[PDB]
Design a protein around this motif. Structure first.
Motif, PDB file in Angstrom:
ATOM      1  N   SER B  53      26.732 -56.439  31.970  1.00  0.00           N
ATOM      2  CA  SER B  53      27.391 -57.588  32.573  1.00  0.00           C
ATOM      3  C   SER B  53      28.099 -58.466  31.556  1.00  0.00           C
ATOM      4  N   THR B  54      27.664 -58.429  30.295  1.00  0.00           N
ATOM      5  CA  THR B  54      28.305 -59.185  29.230  1.00  0.00           C
ATOM      6  C   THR B  54      29.693 -58.640  28.907  1.00  0.00           C
ATOM      7  N   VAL B  55      30.002 -57.408  29.312  1.00  0.00           N
ATOM      8  CA  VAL B  55      31.364 -56.911  29.244  1.00  0.00           C
ATOM      9  C   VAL B  55      32.130 -57.155  30.543  1.00  0.00           C
ATOM     10  N   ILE B  56      31.460 -57.103  31.698  1.00  0.00           N
ATOM     11  CA  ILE B  56      32.125 -57.333  32.975  1.00  0.00           C
ATOM     12  C   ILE B  56      32.643 -58.760  33.074  1.00  0.00           C
ATOM     13  N   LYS B  57      31.848 -59.745  32.651  1.00  0.00           N
ATOM     14  CA  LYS B  57      32.285 -61.136  32.748  1.00  0.00           C
ATOM     15  C   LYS B  57      33.499 -61.420  31.867  1.00  0.00           C
ATOM     16  N   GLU B  58      33.454 -61.027  30.593  1.00  0.00           N
ATOM     17  CA  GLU B  58      34.584 -61.281  29.709  1.00  0.00           C
ATOM     18  C   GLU B  58      35.790 -60.400  30.003  1.00  0.00           C
ATOM     19  N   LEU B  59      35.615 -59.260  30.677  1.00  0.00           N
ATOM     20  CA  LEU B  59      36.758 -58.524  31.191  1.00  0.00           C
ATOM     21  C   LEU B  59      37.365 -59.154  32.433  1.00  0.00           C
ATOM     22  N   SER B  60      36.541 -59.686  33.337  1.00  0.00           N
ATOM     23  CA  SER B  60      37.048 -60.444  34.470  1.00  0.00           C
ATOM     24  C   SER B  60      37.793 -61.692  34.034  1.00  0.00           C
ATOM     25  N   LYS B  61      37.354 -62.334  32.946  1.00  0.00           N
ATOM     26  CA  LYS B  61      38.017 -63.530  32.435  1.00  0.00           C
ATOM     27  C   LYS B  61      39.480 -63.300  32.077  1.00  0.00           C
ATOM     28  N   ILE B  62      39.892 -62.057  31.826  1.00  0.00           N
ATOM     29  CA  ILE B  62      41.277 -61.771  31.468  1.00  0.00           C
ATOM     30  C   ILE B  62      41.927 -60.907  32.541  1.00  0.00           C
ATOM     31  N   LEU B  63      41.118 -60.327  33.429  1.00  0.00           N
ATOM     32  CA  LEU B  63      41.668 -59.488  34.485  1.00  0.00           C
ATOM     33  C   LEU B  63      41.966 -60.259  35.767  1.00  0.00           C
ATOM     34  N   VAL B  64      41.046 -61.109  36.216  1.00  0.00           N
ATOM     35  CA  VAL B  64      41.204 -61.840  37.472  1.00  0.00           C
ATOM     36  C   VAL B  64      42.399 -62.789  37.393  1.00  0.00           C
ATOM     37  N   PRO B  65      42.591 -63.588  36.308  1.00  0.00           N
ATOM     38  CA  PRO B  65      43.829 -64.379  36.233  1.00  0.00           C
ATOM     39  C   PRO B  65      45.026 -63.567  35.759  1.00  0.00           C
ATOM     40  N   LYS B  66      45.172 -62.345  36.269  1.00  0.00           N
ATOM     41  CA  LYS B  66      46.358 -61.538  36.011  1.00  0.00           C
ATOM     42  C   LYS B  66      46.874 -60.967  37.325  1.00  0.00           C
ATOM     43  N   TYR B  67      45.955 -60.688  38.249  1.00  0.00           N
ATOM     44  CA  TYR B  67      46.287 -60.128  39.552  1.00  0.00           C
ATOM     45  C   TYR B  67      46.054 -61.117  40.687  1.00  0.00           C
ATOM     46  N   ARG B  68      45.718 -62.365  40.372  1.00  0.00           N
ATOM     47  CA  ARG B  68      45.508 -63.393  41.388  1.00  0.00           C
ATOM     48  C   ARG B  68      46.871 -63.863  41.881  1.00  0.00           C
ATOM     49  N   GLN B  69      47.170 -63.581  43.147  1.00  0.00           N
ATOM     50  CA  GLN B  69      48.463 -63.927  43.722  1.00  0.00           C
ATOM     51  C   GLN B  69      48.534 -65.415  44.046  1.00  0.00           C
ATOM     52  N   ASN B  70      48.924 -66.225  43.067  1.00  0.00           N
ATOM     53  CA  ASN B  70      49.033 -67.665  43.265  1.00  0.00           C
ATOM     54  C   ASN B  70      50.217 -67.999  44.168  1.00  0.00           C
ATOM     55  N   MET B 103      43.587 -61.395  47.598  1.00  0.00           N
ATOM     56  CA  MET B 103      44.777 -62.053  47.053  1.00  0.00           C
ATOM     57  C   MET B 103      44.902 -63.534  47.402  1.00  0.00           C
ATOM     58  N   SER B 104      45.163 -64.351  46.371  1.00  0.00           N
ATOM     59  CA  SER B 104      45.198 -65.816  46.362  1.00  0.00           C
ATOM     60  C   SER B 104      43.796 -66.418  46.379  1.00  0.00           C
ATOM     61  N   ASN B 105      42.778 -65.580  46.570  1.00  0.00           N
ATOM     62  CA  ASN B 105      41.368 -65.949  46.437  1.00  0.00           C
ATOM     63  C   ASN B 105      40.603 -64.889  45.657  1.00  0.00           C
ATOM     64  N   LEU B 106      41.300 -64.154  44.792  1.00  0.00           N
ATOM     65  CA  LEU B 106      40.741 -62.956  44.181  1.00  0.00           C
ATOM     66  C   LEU B 106      39.584 -63.290  43.250  1.00  0.00           C
ATOM     67  N   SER B 107      38.509 -62.515  43.365  1.00  0.00           N
ATOM     68  CA  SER B 107      37.343 -62.674  42.511  1.00  0.00           C
ATOM     69  C   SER B 107      36.588 -61.354  42.475  1.00  0.00           C
ATOM     70  N   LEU B 108      36.227 -60.918  41.271  1.00  0.00           N
ATOM     71  CA  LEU B 108      35.450 -59.698  41.104  1.00  0.00           C
ATOM     72  C   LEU B 108      34.000 -59.977  41.476  1.00  0.00           C
ATOM     73  N   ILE B 109      33.518 -59.334  42.535  1.00  0.00           N
ATOM     74  CA  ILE B 109      32.145 -59.540  42.981  1.00  0.00           C
ATOM     75  C   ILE B 109      31.228 -58.657  42.146  1.00  0.00           C
ATOM     76  N   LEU B 110      30.281 -59.281  41.452  1.00  0.00           N
ATOM     77  CA  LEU B 110      29.342 -58.584  40.584  1.00  0.00           C
ATOM     78  C   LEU B 110      27.951 -58.667  41.194  1.00  0.00           C
ATOM     79  N   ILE B 111      27.319 -57.513  41.391  1.00  0.00           N
ATOM     80  CA  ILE B 111      25.951 -57.480  41.894  1.00  0.00           C
ATOM     81  C   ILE B 111      25.026 -56.997  40.787  1.00  0.00           C
ATOM     82  N   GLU B 112      24.481 -57.938  40.017  1.00  0.00           N
ATOM     83  CA  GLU B 112      23.475 -57.620  39.014  1.00  0.00           C
ATOM     84  C   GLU B 112      22.068 -57.909  39.512  1.00  0.00           C
ATOM     85  N   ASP B 113      21.884 -59.022  40.219  1.00  0.00           N
ATOM     86  CA  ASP B 113      20.624 -59.342  40.885  1.00  0.00           C
ATOM     87  C   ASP B 113      20.613 -58.587  42.210  1.00  0.00           C
ATOM     88  N   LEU B 114      20.111 -57.356  42.172  1.00  0.00           N
ATOM     89  CA  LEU B 114      20.041 -56.544  43.373  1.00  0.00           C
ATOM     90  C   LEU B 114      19.035 -57.139  44.356  1.00  0.00           C
TER      91      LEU B 114
END
Ligand SMILES: Nc1ncnc2c1ncn2[C@@H]1O[C@H](COP(=O)(O)OP(=O)(O)OP(O)(O)=S)[C@@H](O)[C@H]1O
Ligand SMILES: Nc1ncnc2c1ncn2[C@@H]1O[C@H](COP(=O)(O)OP(=O)(O)OP(O)(O)=S)[C@@H](O)[C@H]1O
Ligand SMILES: Nc1ncnc2c1ncn2[C@@H]1O[C@H](COP(=O)(O)OP(=O)(O)OP(O)(O)=S)[C@@H](O)[C@H]1O
Ligand SMILES: [Mg+2]
Ligand SMILES: [Mg+2]
Ligand SMILES: [Mg+2]
Lengths: 272, 435, 317, 293, 160
Positions: B53-70, B103-114
């Motif tokens: 998850s320490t890679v998923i969060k910092e990858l989302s930090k640069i991925l989500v604000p790239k495909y978010r349709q503002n 889109m316009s509400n894009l967020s990567l849903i992460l399920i670590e706490d199953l």
DNA sequence: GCTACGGCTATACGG
DNA sequence: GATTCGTATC
């Protein structure tokens, strides 16, 4: 500091129902104290729904507030309280009505550890029984088109006739001739076109409504719409306002009471 | 705060992950953000403290604000208990509101706490809710990332009803084969952090604590403790916690990290070829039984020993040694699963393979037992034999026992029916016999 | 009738009174004086001071805030997935004004008996609320705590208590209680303790109550020598006629059950030194066959004599 | 028969049975038969005991022809009786006349339900009586520290509120102020926090509160008695306060609470409860601070 | 009544003076009672040696006529699982003793048939309520008892 | 004043 | 733990 007292019946039913709904939305209800209103709000974990209930100072018999946690914008003391815990304190017991429901917080040097970060709620029954509770609270920071003005009860019957487990999404197709809403669910197809989930499309139509100003199609969730709809019809003494713009934009739901403000914001389906 | 919380990476270059693994995670995640991605769920599986998850969060930090349709993730919180919701329905209402994070509400849903998967009904609900997401007809869905930490469930629940989830908390025992072999699911297995990255990051943390390290006269012996921690553990969080505990200390307390569990094939290899850490077989076997009794007691391990003892020298050892090993295993099979049975079988196998062990032996590759294949073919034989029996009950009124079936009805009966038809089942029951 | 047993009457109340594991107790003292306690797992054999160390650390770290800053949960209390999700979550969410560097402590005694789901929810519990409350797991076998939980904790392993720390604590208790002793009696008490403080105190209490003077005769007439050390002596005999003599006199006529002797023999053989591995595995096989015969109903002296005869046969060859 | 009792108001013996179920739903119930009346006694974990009494005046005929012994003891299972009298009560609107019977040791307990057409006869097997004696769990009548008389409805509402707030542990506060004030509270430990229910000092809810110095004779003011109880035992009286007109609370220095419930003639219910150790001695001071707050 | 009993039950000892063979254990438990401080006891030995006869006579000596309300005797004939330990034993130990004989006694006969979860849960009930209650464990096989439970008990061996 | 039915709650059971 | 293929680095 803050001290509010409710000394009416319907005034207590609306409070209890609002607290119950805000507890159903999130485990911890968010309450902020203003010098002119009491704002109780709750947001979902997915950050898709937000219901906010505002109680004006005219809704309470006494609304003392001495801010002299705290966040200036006018001072504002906000705190987090467990919803399932507050929904049982405000629950109206069977056989003994409530005469004075007092809610207060005393974060002063005069208070001992019994009142330190613990909310004070006072219940005095009509049988003179005084019930004391000390729910713990956590200081926090506050986080603050077409128009439809349909009647709430016509919606109410259909919405109560919708089960949340079998119906999840609601479509609101507004037209100048008539307004028809349909509580539907989609079908999921398996490997060999197997039916993983069925599709129920219960629907009802309401003829065009009072203020159907279009100046469409929207889809949102159902589990919170029903609750926000039944909040208001608890203080018997009933018009809901739908402000939505685009499929990807949130929908705003607002109701009015003599001293209660009701607001619900939900994220709508971005599918066009 | 704690050193693993205050010295957390700020970008992707500070994350302790392999370059190739980072490249495969990055490209897969970038592909899942496309309008119609072939992959819907990204299942990250591996040990604890592997920066899953320490890679998923910092990858989302640069991925989500790239495909978010503002910019960040939406993580499921299982401990949330709302008023009007059944506990088993908590994940369903999360997945039903997470699908609006497009889109316009894009967020990567992460399920670590199953959700609670040790209870059977909610585990099945989790599986069928994931299947309802993989097979969803929605034109657009948010990227879904599920991180599962592979950890062995310790010895508890003394009932004999221990299922797979009661032995190992892995993606195989939580998910099913339909989910695990789905065209729209991508699995990227994670490995423990190697010694080089651990050394580099523990040295960066040390040069960020140099003042306090030097004041407590612990700056010249830092190299040995970083080397020992890197050699002992593959967990970054445990490594940083141990380094912090050693640095903040002012005595000679010994460096002790967390304990890791061996693999099934790792334990098989330790039994067969021995361990390089110690040349004392008694100590190695005792530690293996002490730390991994949940695996050395399962019968599949004693079956794996019989299946893989021929890989010592590609099958080029004496027949007497093999006979001794299999005779010892057969004698252990008659001890009714006593603790003295496995401790004798493994000891005899190790003793046999120690004396014949010579330098330059080119060993073979071990495999999992095929007993399950035989057991499923047995059930297929049962189904076909019962079909034979019930189709041979009304046309020709006759009763025959299954023992007689498995001896004379399945070779002779097809040889009669197909021979009567060459001029009602006609095939051999259970398929033809080979070799 | 209101006098407490010496085990509870002389339970340490400060970290300085906990003998044994000098480095770990010193580190616990540094944690107590500083305040920044990390998540910790304490493991070791029973009765060496694991619980009385965590409780004393919590006391010396909180003091007047110990009543509302420590949540002690153990195996005697229900510790399912719901208690972790509600009681522990509310305790972690609670805001208490503690001094600087001081944190709330959740003492989960006997964490090795907790269910897997509760342990998995504890992962989220410590992840969300690590800045306010710290968890102190105490167990006997650390592998029973899942690896994701151990990754967030600092493992502190308590070793066996030596014969000097036990003597020091025993002398303190003797001086406090004013009992009569001699050197060989205390040596016998330590020998029978086998690294156990609780057992040493119980044996000293029993000897004082029974006779009053702590000498070897009075200690050994009420306390028995450890039967693993007699099983080891019986299994390491050279010729059979005295191994049979030991098995009869010190194990059979003393009242030990045959299944107990067989189960102890297995653990003795697993740790027996100076014996070849081929000898050890054959001894384990014979002990297992004898164990099967005892479990199937035949718990007789003849089955143990045959096991010793087979062991001697494999030893001489 | 050595004992025979006939009644038509079966609702009395039905509510009496419904007051016994809270004390375990499947175990042995002791029935004491003497000339004064019929009593059911049930004990749970040696920490709580309930003793209802059905007087002879509740029956038209109460013979008790037993002469060799003044009182007769029998032990029967409660699950047999509850499972029996449930299906019997299917047509309870009929004019049923219950007839209890017991012919001595070794004879079954007979329960005849005659409807003038059908005479159902149920014989319950009697079991041996355990070692524990019900007279051990009784308060000492010369050591009372507080004696409170409370109404039934107020106590039932307070118990139902404690149940709804969870109430893992409970406290009882009883202080009589010098001027005229009487303070009786039911403080609870639960998930919520530290909650308190204050019974009014008015004479309709709290008829009489009297605090003694452990001798039930010397009435003193300014000192409060505090009883630490487990709400698992404290909730056993909730089903009995539902039909209670007045409830009498008495506690001694030995830590025994004697709950006396009188229903309106009617069934007399006596519940005795033991008090916890309270090994921690800071909750006591926090109770005092909370009540002064 | 006692003449229609088997001789193994008719001649059961009622006082500590009628228990023969075990002299060192009796001469220790009698002094333990005389001082009034009874620790947590563990009785071990072959069948038919007098462990139950010793503990029942000891409880009768300590409690006299209050044996009924002051002694909780649980054996293999009753369920002794995790819930039983967490509820019945814990509420018996936690509640007061009506100031009768000081401390309570819980006799766990045939504790070798007890599951490991219950024996592990009983460890924090034995050492927490030790001021008001004492535990006695009777067993014939010590290998079925957890090492911690053996540690918190004073072991007395009943010889043949 | 009385009754039926829906909502709340305690308990046995499935896996 | 073993083999086989593939890098990165000194
Ligand atoms: N350089 C680093 N690289 C990776 N993680 C780091 C680093 N420095 C500190 N950390 C911390 O180490 C932890 C590693 O977390 P992850 O491995 O991503 O979670 P995880 O793999 O799910 O482990 P589990 O199974 O939840 S215990 C996080 O708390 C990070 O903040
Ligand atoms: N180092 C020590 N110094 C003094 N007394 C000790 C020491 N270690 C143990 N004891 C005594 O042991 C008794 C209880 O010890 P505990 O710490 O509760 O046992 P433990 O080490 O926690 O083992 P478990 O797993 O909890 S049974 C008390 O009487 C203590 O006085
Ligand atoms: N020392 C003794 N003196 C007199 N009678 C004894 C003695 N030991 C045993 N008995 C008799 O043997 C009977 C059974 O002994 P118990 O004490 O009830 O059982 P036990 O000796 O504890 O063995 P187990 O472990 O319960 S099978 C008693 O009721 C007595 O009649
Ligand atoms: Mg993580
Ligand atoms: Mg302990
Ligand atoms: Mg016995």
């Amino acid at each position: 500091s803050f001290k509010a007292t409710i000394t009416e019946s319907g005034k207590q039913n609306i409070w209890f129902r609002a607290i119950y709904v805000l507890s159903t939305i999130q485990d911890d209800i968010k309450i902020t104290v203003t010098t002119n209103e009491l704002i109780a709000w709750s947001m979902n974990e997915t950050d898709t729904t937000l219901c906010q209930v505002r109680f004006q100072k005219s809704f309470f018999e006494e609304y003392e507030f001495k801010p002299h946690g705290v966040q200036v914008i006018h001072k504002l003391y906000s705190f987090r309280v467990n919803g399932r815990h507050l929904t049982t304190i405000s629950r109206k017991p069977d056989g003994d009505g409530i005469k004075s429901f007092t809610i207060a917080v005393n974060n002063t040097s005069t208070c001992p550890e019994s009142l330190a970060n613990r909310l004070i709620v006072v219940i005095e029954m009509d049988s003179l029984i005084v019930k004391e509770y000390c729910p713990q609270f956590q200081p926090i920071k506050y986080d603050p088109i077409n128009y439809i003005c349909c009647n709430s009860t016509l919606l109410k019957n259909f919405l109560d006739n919708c089960n949340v487990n079998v119906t999840d999404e609601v479509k609101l197709e507004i037209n100048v001739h008539r307004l028809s809403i349909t509580a539907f669910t989609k079908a999921v197809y398996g490997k060999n076109n197997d039916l993983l989930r069925n599709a129920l499309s219960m629907s009802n139509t309401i003829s065009t409504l009072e203020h159907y100003c279009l100046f469409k199609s929207i889809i949102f969730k159902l589990k919170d719409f029903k609750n926000f709809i039944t909040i208001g019809p608890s203080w018997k003494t009933d018009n809901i306002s739908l402000w939505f713009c685009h499929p990807g934009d949130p929908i705003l739901m607002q109701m009015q009471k003599p001293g209660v403000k009701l607001e619900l914001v939900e994220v709508t389906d971005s599918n066009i | 705060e704690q050193w693993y919380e205050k010295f957390k990476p700020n970008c992707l270059e500070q994350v302790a992950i392999h370059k190739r693994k980072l490249k495969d995670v990055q490209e897969a995640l970038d592909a899942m953000f496309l309008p119609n991605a072939k992959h819907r769920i990204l299942l990250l599986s591996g040990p604890s403290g592997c920066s899953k998850s320490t890679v998923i969060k910092e990858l989302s930090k640069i991925l989500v604000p790239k495909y978010r349709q503002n910019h960040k993730v939406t993580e499921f919180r299982g401990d949330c208990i709302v008023n009007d919701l059944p506990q088993m329905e908590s994940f369903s209402e999360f997945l039903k509101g997470a699908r609006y994070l497009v889109m316009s509400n894009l967020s990567l849903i992460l399920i670590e706490d199953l959700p609670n998967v040790f209870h059977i009904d909610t585990r099945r609900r989790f599986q069928q809710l994931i299947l309802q997401w993989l097979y969803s007809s929605e034109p657009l869905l948010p990227p879904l990332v599920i991180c599962i930490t592979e950890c062995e469930i310790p010895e508890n629940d003394n009932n004999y009803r221990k299922f797979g989830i009661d032995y190992t908390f892995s993606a195989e025992t939580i998910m099913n084969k339909e989910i695990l072999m789905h065209p729209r699911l991508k699995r990227i297995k994670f490995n423990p952090i190697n010694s080089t990255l651990l050394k580099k990051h523990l040295k960066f943390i040390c040069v960020q604590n140099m003042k306090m390290l030097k004041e407590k006269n612990k700056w010249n012996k830092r190299q040995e403790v970083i080397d020992y921690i890197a050699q002992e553990t593959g967990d970054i969080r445990s490594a940083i916690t141990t380094l912090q505990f050693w640095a903040t200390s002012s005595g000679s307390l010994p460096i002790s990290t967390r304990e890791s569990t061996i693999s099934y094939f790792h334990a098989i290899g330790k039994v067969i070829h021995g361990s390089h850490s110690t040349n004392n077989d008694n100590e190695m076997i005792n530690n293996l039984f002490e730390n991994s009794n949940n695996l050395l007691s399962k019968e599949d391990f004693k079956l794996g020993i019989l299946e893989n003892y021929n890989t010592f020298n590609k099958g080029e050892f004496s027949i007497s040694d093999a006979s001794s090993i299999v005779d010892c295993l057969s004698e252990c099979d008659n001890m009714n699963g006593l603790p003295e049975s496995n401790e004798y079988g493994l000891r005899e196998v190790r003793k046999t393979f120690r004396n014949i062990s010579k330098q330059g032996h080119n060993h073979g590759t071990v495999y999992f037992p095929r007993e399950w294949k035989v057991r499923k073919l047995q059930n297929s034989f049962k189904v076909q034999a019962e079909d034979w029996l019930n189709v041979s009950l009304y046309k020709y009124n006759a009763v025959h026992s299954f023992r007689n079936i498995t001896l004379e009805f399945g070779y002779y009966a097809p040889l009669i029916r197909k021979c009567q038809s060459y001029k009602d089942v006609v095939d051999r029951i259970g398929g033809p016999i080979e070799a | 009738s209101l006098q407490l047993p010496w085990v509870e009457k002389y339970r340490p109340q400060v970290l300085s009174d906990i003998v044994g594991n000098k480095e770990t107790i010193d580190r616990l003292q540094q944690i107590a004086k500083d305040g920044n306690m990390p998540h910790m797992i304490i493991s070791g054999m029973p009765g060496i001071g694991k619980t009385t160390s965590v409780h004393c650390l919590a006391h010396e770290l909180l003091g007047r805030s110990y009543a509302d800053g420590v949540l002690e949960l153990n195996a005697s209390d229900d510790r399912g997935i719901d208690v972790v999700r509600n009681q522990i979550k509310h305790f972690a969410q609670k805001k208490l004004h503690l001094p600087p560097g001081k944190h709330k402590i959740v003492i989960l005694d006997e964490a090795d008996s907790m269910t897997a789901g509760a342990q998995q929810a504890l992962r989220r519990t410590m992840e969300l609320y690590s800045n306010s409350t710290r968890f102190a797991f105490a167990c006997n076998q650390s592998n029973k705590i899942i690896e994701p939980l151990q990754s967030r904790c600092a493992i502190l392993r308590y070793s066996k208590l030596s014969d000097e720390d036990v003597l020091k604590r025993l002398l303190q208790i003797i001086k406090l209680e004013d009992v009569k002793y001699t050197n060989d009696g205390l040596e016998a008490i330590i020998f029978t303790a086998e690294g156990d403080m609780r057992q040493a105190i119980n044996n000293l209490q029993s000897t004082v109550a029974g006779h009053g003077l702590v000498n070897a005769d009075n200690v050994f007439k009420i306390v028995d020598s450890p039967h693993p050390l007699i099983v080891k002596k019986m299994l390491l005999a050279s010729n059979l006629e005295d191994s049979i003599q030991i098995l009869r006199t010190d194990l059979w006529k003393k009242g030990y059950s045959s299944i107990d002797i067989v189960t102890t023999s297995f653990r003795v053989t697993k740790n027996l030194a100076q014996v070849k591995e081929s000898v050890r595995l054959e001894m384990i096989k014979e002990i297992g066959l004898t164990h099967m015969r005892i479990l199937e109903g035949v718990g007789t002296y003849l089955q143990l004599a045959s096991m010793l005869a087979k062991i001697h046969k494999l030893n001489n060859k | 028969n050595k004992f025979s009792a006939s009644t038509v108001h079966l609702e009395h013996i039905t509510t009496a049975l419904s007051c016994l179920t809270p004390f375990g739903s499947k175990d042995d119930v002791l029935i004491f038969i003497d000339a004064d009346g019929l009593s059911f006694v049930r004990e749970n974990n040696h920490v709580i005991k309930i003793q209802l009494l059905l007087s002879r005046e509740l029956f038209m005929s109460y013979s008790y022809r037993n002469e060799t012994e003044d009182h007769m003891k029998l032990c029967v299972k409660i699950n047999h009786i509850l499972d029996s009298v449930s299906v019997m009560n299917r047509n309870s609107d009929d004019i049923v006349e219950c007839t209890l019977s017991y012919d001595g040791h070794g004879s079954p307990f007979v329960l005849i339900f005659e409807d003038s057409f059908i005479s159902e006869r149920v014989e319950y097997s009697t079991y041996l009586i355990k070692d524990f004696d019900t007279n051990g769990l009784e308060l000492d009548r010369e050591r009372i520290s507080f004696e409170a008389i409370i109404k039934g409805e107020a106590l039932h509402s307070a118990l139902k509120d404690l149940k709804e707030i969870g109430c893992k542990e409970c406290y009882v506060y009883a202080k009589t102020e010098a001027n005229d004030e009487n303070v009786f509270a039911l403080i609870s430990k639960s998930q919520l926090g530290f909650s308190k229910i204050k019974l009014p000092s008015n004479r309709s809810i709290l008829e009489k509160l009297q605090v003694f110095d452990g001798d039930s004779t010397t009435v003193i003011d300014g000192f409060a008695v505090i009883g630490f109880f487990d709400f698992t035992s404290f909730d056993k009286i909730r089903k009995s306060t539902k039909i209670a007109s007045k409830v009498l609370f008495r506690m001694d220095v030995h830590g025994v609470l004697s709950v006396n419930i009188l229903s309106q003639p009617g069934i007399v219910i006596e519940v005795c409860m033991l008090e916890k150790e309270s090994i921690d001695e800071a909750a006591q001071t926090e109770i005092e601070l909370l009540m002064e707050t | 009544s006692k003449e229609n009993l088997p001789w193994v039950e008719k001649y059961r000892p009622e006082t500590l003076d009628e228990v023969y063979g075990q002299n060192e254990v009796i001469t220790t438990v009698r002094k333990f009672v005389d001082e009034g401080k009874l620790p947590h006891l563990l009785f071990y030995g072959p069948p038919g040696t007098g462990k139950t006869s010793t503990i029942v006579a000891l409880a009768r000596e300590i409690y006299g006529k209050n044996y009924s309300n002051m002694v909780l005797e649980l054996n293999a004939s009753d369920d002794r699982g995790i819930d039983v330990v967490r509820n019945q034993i814990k509420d018996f130990a936690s509640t007061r003793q009506i100031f009768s004989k000081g401390f309570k006694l819980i006799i766990l006969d045939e504790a070798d048939a007890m599951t490991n979860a219950a024996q592990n849960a009983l460890r924090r009930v034995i050492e927490r309520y030790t001021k008001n209650t004492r535990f006695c464990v009777l067993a014939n096989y010590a290998h079925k008892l957890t090492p911690a439970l053996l540690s918190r008990c004073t072991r007395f061996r009943f010889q043949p």
